[PDB]
Design a protein around this nucleic acid. Structure first.
Ligand SMILES: [Mg+2]
Length: 1051
RNA sequence: CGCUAAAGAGGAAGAGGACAGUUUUAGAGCUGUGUU
RNA sequence: AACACAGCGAGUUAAAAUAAGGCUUAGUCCGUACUCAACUUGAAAAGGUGGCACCGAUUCGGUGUU
DNA sequence: TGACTCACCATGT
DNA sequence: CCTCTTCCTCTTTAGCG
DNA sequence: TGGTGAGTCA
């Protein structure tokens, strides 16, 4: 029997359905391997495959660039330290050493607690004389007195460590008029104002009430000044709290005004220091180096280098400064030396690296995939475009009947006279020329509406900048012009643009040269120079451009030149293109590269895998059709490649399987007309129901009207034939062929939409990113947690391994990659007594590699004197308990084996009578449908049976009891409560995408819901040791049709 | 279905740089009393 | 000597880290992207393994056969 | 001393 | 939050296999 | 939405 696959490719789901005949999904008994007693499990061929959504690489890119910037910053400080090392060693041996051990607790510090000066008194004096670093920077910048070298290094390292934004280009040099340092003076002003205003607010809040004083200033937890300085509060929250407190108090207008202008007790380091140019820091740096150079000689020699450390930005075109082994770097080194900031010009070739940066990402031409595309603004590309549009210009003749294309000489004269004269060509100018050259008047133009899309913009621009028409006119100079446009396109920095442009300096003038240096064009074309001009045809010895400009017989567009049988352009392109044989091998490689975000790419790859395994399931008989709907078009191409690869002859490729792309509206139209409603909340069976329905629709549409088929198949709607609003049986019109029967086939459609069994599968993944509230997370939390409590049990990853997590605080939230079952012998009961213990051990993403290197050693470090088997369970591994409860194992906690997050794999099935009610309930607030209101008003008695069914399903397969009791207590108000609240409680708010009562019975993680005004907490207390007793691990396949039940008890 | 160009709209990949946030330490704790 | 109860004062900043880390790959580089049912040939590229029909549906069950 | 409960929280412009 | 670069995709126009 | 700290009971 024949069969046709259907598919629902999607971001988080792929739904697969197989139809043999008469719109029916066949049932096949699939063997079950493993230590089980169920030899054959009979599975319906409806199915779904659920996967975690693919993640874009933006977060990885942002964290990679951040990582690199921290590394480069520490390298800049190390550079300044190597500059200061020889002279500082006499002043203080361990100043750098004391700075490096600032994090450490006093005992673990190598020399002293006080970082800067190493003794209590001098540190006290430093903080007294300069309360903040900005006072120090101002003093060094403006005081012509010898400074302790430590202080100078601290100021310079403050500027290098925190330098300003580089957006402003040029040289940049406030209320203060005499100071060298503007920023230092402004922040010293903020220091003084904040101190004085703190004193005044202290007096006021204390005087009204001492309790307010204590709460605001001496209680860190609150949002007051104690929260502002020694807490997690921010300016906005502190202002809100202060205004709320101060509003009641009488006469507190000064503080309220300053808060209103957002300048009341401001902090020197604020989110508002972002808009500070680096030139301000450089102005301070120059002053400090200059004034202290006279006293310290080494500063005079290294003054240029110290500035270079601050102002050096790795150019964007010169990427990561690798020697290789880096996937992202493109830099092309010219020497072998290490890349210090001073020698970056020497070591690296900026021209070659900048050219590689653009040419690595440019696209090879499709027609002849061996050459790079021409620059978008090249004269050749425009001249190719201008003629191509101009050739097909057809003018209606006032007297002559014939509608005729432009003559070649007319094309030459038109382009010369007008296209070169004016940037924007129109219809009117061409009608004028045609009237001038030919006496006919009243001519209109075809192929051209109003302005020409094509223009020689580059010709006019280069004419003005060059200031010479003759240079553009001459064909000999055309190669020079092409090289000029190439250097403008590839190179973006004006310096290197003029550097390469200096080659063609003899022809032009320097003033013209610089003006050309300003002009940079962007973008690249989709054709190549060799194609347009290099390729030739033997019979005429003419390029494609030569034919477009002058093809005597008629004006033919570029594709017509390429495809014409007489011309050898088609032979040339085919020769080159099958020289370019890049099938890419495995389907993984081609699927990775199709257009889109990785999220859809995952769906596509899994859809190919489902189709392959479905072919294996059905006996190896290739599908009669496949119907991808994306309810992706790239799949159609990919599925065409694998299935329709075979060609009877090299001349053409035969097609056997019709990859089909139904439009989305068809499924919705069928669903609404015949009331096969979908509720996304109830169960995940809707993906499979959608796939089966579209398989049915596509089969019928191809069955009844073959005429539309060519459009529908790859390479007044049709839904009316599904509508009988007509004889009982529908048969093809104009021929005798099978068409869908109006009632009997509908019976099969509804029954297959009321099948309890759908082979739902959640792909077992070994996680690499932890998940918090749906946002990816790494190995652990990105923010260091506070120091543990004095007598609190914490599993904190240290900041660095040499730093103890207890004393120095640590990282919390270790994410678990997977969990391994370990049968073996464990010391238990403190007597080391042997036992046959089958218990999970969770493995973190942190130590995944360590586990993989030696599984036995990792498991043995955790006990397990003898290990006899290690079943390795990825996330979402499925256990079916004895009762019939399926508990997918999300993870086993790394810290504790006996705690883990277990989802619920059981999917509730609701009869059609309930599903209609639920769909109506979710759509109640919708203004469009009165029928929803009337149905929910007429069938309120369904709600009682629905609640009881959800609660019994909760009782048997789910394990929630307290939530069930709260739900039962809440439901007693069913007879009298708001119908809007009844519906929202059962299904959810309209459009919320959050389920109501069905969040108790949905698959996956449990989430909080509100039922009739009662907040029901999420049930997350499934225990990981309940899986082990009397349950069977199910190793389902990608389709889910093929499973291996490894019973844990016999194991 | 595949192309080229124009005006619109929306993404993807990559490079460079800034500001904050978090953690520990250094820079403010002192006095009277309860207390073992 | 330490823990606390009350009173009175300071509070703005600096250093270090900012995914743990890995390497003969030692770079001013890489470390959250894509890939991953089970058993079994596979160093690896890539492959192999699971009969059909019929009646029904609270998750698949029961039949007829080979 | 391990199942059965509840509460807090997490990097962004 | 700022600067830069390329590659894609969707509807519509002009030509087109 | 997943870690997991902390509390009370058989
Ligand atoms: Mg690092």
């Amino acid at each position: 029997k024949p069969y046709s696959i259907g598919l629902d490719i999607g971001t988080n789901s792929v739904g697969w359905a197989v139809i043999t005949d008469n719109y029916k999904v066949p049932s096949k008994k699939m063997k079950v391997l493993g230590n089980t007693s169920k030899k054959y499990i009979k599975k319906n061929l409806l199915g779904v495959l659920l996967f975690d959504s693919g993640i874009t690489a933006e977060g990885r890119r942002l964290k990679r660039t951040a990582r690199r910037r921290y590394t480069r910053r520490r390298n800049r400080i190390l550079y300044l330290q190597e500059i200061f090392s020889t002279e500082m060693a006499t002043l203080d041996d361990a100043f750098f050493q004391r700075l490096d051990d600032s994090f450490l607790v006093p005992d673990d510090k190598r020399d002293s607690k006080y970082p800067i000066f190493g003794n209590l008194v001098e540190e006290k004096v430093y903080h007294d004389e300069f309360p903040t670093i900005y006072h120090l920077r101002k003093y060094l910048a403006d005081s012509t007195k010898k400074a302790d070298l430590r202080l100078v290094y601290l100021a310079l390292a403050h500027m290098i460590k925190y330098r300003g934004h580089f957006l402003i280009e040029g040289e940049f040099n406030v209320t203060d008029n005499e100071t060298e340092a503007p920023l230092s003076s402004a922040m010293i002003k903020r220091y003084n104002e904040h101190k004085e205003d703190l004193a005044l607010l202290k007096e006021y809040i204390r005087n009204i009430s001492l309790k307010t004083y204590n709460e605001v200033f001496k209680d860190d937890t609150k949002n007051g000044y104690a929260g502002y300085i020694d807490g997690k509060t921010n300016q906005e929250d502190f202002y809100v709290y202060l205004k709320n407190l101060l509003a009641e108090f009488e006469g507190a207008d000064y503080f309220l005004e300053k808060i209103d202008r957002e300048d009341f007790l401001r902090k020197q380091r604020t989110f508002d220091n972002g808009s500070i140019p680096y030139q301000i820091h450089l102005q301070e740096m120059r002053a400090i180096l200059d004034k202290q150079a006279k006293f310290y000689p080494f500063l005079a020699k290294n003054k240029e280098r110290i500035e270079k450390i601050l102002t050096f930005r790795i150019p964007y075109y010169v990427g990561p400064l690798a020697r290789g082994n880096s996937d992202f770097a493109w830099s092309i080194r010219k020497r072998n030396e290490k890349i210090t900031p001073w020698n970056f010009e020497d070591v690296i070739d900026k021209e070659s690296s900048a050219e590689a940066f653009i040419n690595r990402m440019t696209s090879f031409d499709l027609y002849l995939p061996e050459e790079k595309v021409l620059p978008k603004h090249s004269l050749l590309y425009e001249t190719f475009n201008v003629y191509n549009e101009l050739t097909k210009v057809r003018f209606i003749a006032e007297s002559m009947r014939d509608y005729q294309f432009l003559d070649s000489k007319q094309k030459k004269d038109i382009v010369r006279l007008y296209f070169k004269d004016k940037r924007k060509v129109t219809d009117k100018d061409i009608i004028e020329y045609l009237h001038a050259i030919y006496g006919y008047d009243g001519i209109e133009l075809k192929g051209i509406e109003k302005q020409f899309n094509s223009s020689l913009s580059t010709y006019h621009d280069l004419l003005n900048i060059i200031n010479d028409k003759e240079f553009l006119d001459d064909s000999s100079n055309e190669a020079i012009i092409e090289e000029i446009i190439h250097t403008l396109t590839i190179f973006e920095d004006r310096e290197m643009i003029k550097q390469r442009l200096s080659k063609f300096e003899n022809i032009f003038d320097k003033s013209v040269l610089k003006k050309l240096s300003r002009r940079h064009y962007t973008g690249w074309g989709k054709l190549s120079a060799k194609l347009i001009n290099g390729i030739r045809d033997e019979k005429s010895g003419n390029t494609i451009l030569d034919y477009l400009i002058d093809d005597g017989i008629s004006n033919r567009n570029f594709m017509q030149l390429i495809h014409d049988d007489a011309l050898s352009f088609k032979k040339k392109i085919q020769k080159a293109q099958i020289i370019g044989d890049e099938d890419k091998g495995n389907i993984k490689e081609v699927v990775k590269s199709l257009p889109g975000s990785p999220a859809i790419k995952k769906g596509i790859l899994q859809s190919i895998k489902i189709v392959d395994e479905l072919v294996k399931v059905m006996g190896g008989r290739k599908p009669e059709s496949i119907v991808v709907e994306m309810a992706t078009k790239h799949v159609a191409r990919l599925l065409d490649e694998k299935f329709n690869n075979k060609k009877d002859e090299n001349n053409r490729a035969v097609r056997t399987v019709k990859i089909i792309t139904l439009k989305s509206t068809l499924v919705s139209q069928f669903r609404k007309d015949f009331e096969l409603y979908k509720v996304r909340e109830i169960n995940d069976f809707h993906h499979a129901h959608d796939a089966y329905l579209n398989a049915v629709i596509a089969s019928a549409l191809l069955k009844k009207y073959p005429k539309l088929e060519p459009e529908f198949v790859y390479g007044s709607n049709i839904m009316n034939i599904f509508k009988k609003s007509r004889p009982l049986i529908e048969v093809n019109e104009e021929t005798g062929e099978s068409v869908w029967n109006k009632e009997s086939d509908l019976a099969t459609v509804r029954r297959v939409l009321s099948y309890p069994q759908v082979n739902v599968v959640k792909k077992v993944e070994e996680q690499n990113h932890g998940l918090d509230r749906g946002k990816p997370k790494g190995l652990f939390n990105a923010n260091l947690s506070s120091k543990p409590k004095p007598n609190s049990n914490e599993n904190l990853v240290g900041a660095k391994e040499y730093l103890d997590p207890k004393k120095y605080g640590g990282y919390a939230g270790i994410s678990n990659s997977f969990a391994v079952l370990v049968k073996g012998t464990i010391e238990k009961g403190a007597k080391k007594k042997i036992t046959n213990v089958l218990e999970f051990q969770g493995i973190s993403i942190l130590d995944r590699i360590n586990y993989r290197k030696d599984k036995l050693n990792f498991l043995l470090e955790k006990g397990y004197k003898d290990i006899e088997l290690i079943i390795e369970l990825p996330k979402y591994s499925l256990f079916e308990l004895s009762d019939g409860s399926r508990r997918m194992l999300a993870s086993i906690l790394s810290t504790n084996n006996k705690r883990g997050e277990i989802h619920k794999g059981n999917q509730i099935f609701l009869s059609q009578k309930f599903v209609k009610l639920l769909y109506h309930a979710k759509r109640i607030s919708n203004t469009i449908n009165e029928n929803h209101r009337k149905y929910v008003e007429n069938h309120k008695k369904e709600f009682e049976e629905l609640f009881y069914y959800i609660l019994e399903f909760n009782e048997n397969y789910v394990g929630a009891k307290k939530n069930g009791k709260l739900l039962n207590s809440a439901f007693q108000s069913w007879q009298n409560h708001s119908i809007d609240e009844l519906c929202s409680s059962f299904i959810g708010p309209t459009g919320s995408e959050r389920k109501g009562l069905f969040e108790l019975t949905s698959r996956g993680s449990a989430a909080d819901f509100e039922f009739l005004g009662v907040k029901i907490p999420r049930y997350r207390d499934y225990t990981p040791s309940s899986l082990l007793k009397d349950a069977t691990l199910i190793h389902q396949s990608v389709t889910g049709l093929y499973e291996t039940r490894i019973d844990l008890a016999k194991l």
